[PDB]
Amino acid sequence: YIIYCNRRTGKCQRM
């Protein structure tokens, strides 16, 4: 699944 928040670039996950 997706458990990572790339807030750095402006992307996030759902988990």
**Which amino acid does the sequence have at 10?**
G
**Two tokens at 6?**
């790339």
Q: Give the method of determination.
A: NMR
Positive/negative CA dihedral, 4, 2, 13, 15? negative
In order of 7, 15, the CA distances from 3 in angstroms are 12, 5
DSSP state of 9: T
Chain breaks in the chain (C to N over 2.5 A) after: none
Which one-letter amino acid corresponds to residue 14?
A: R
Per DSSP, 13 falls in state: -
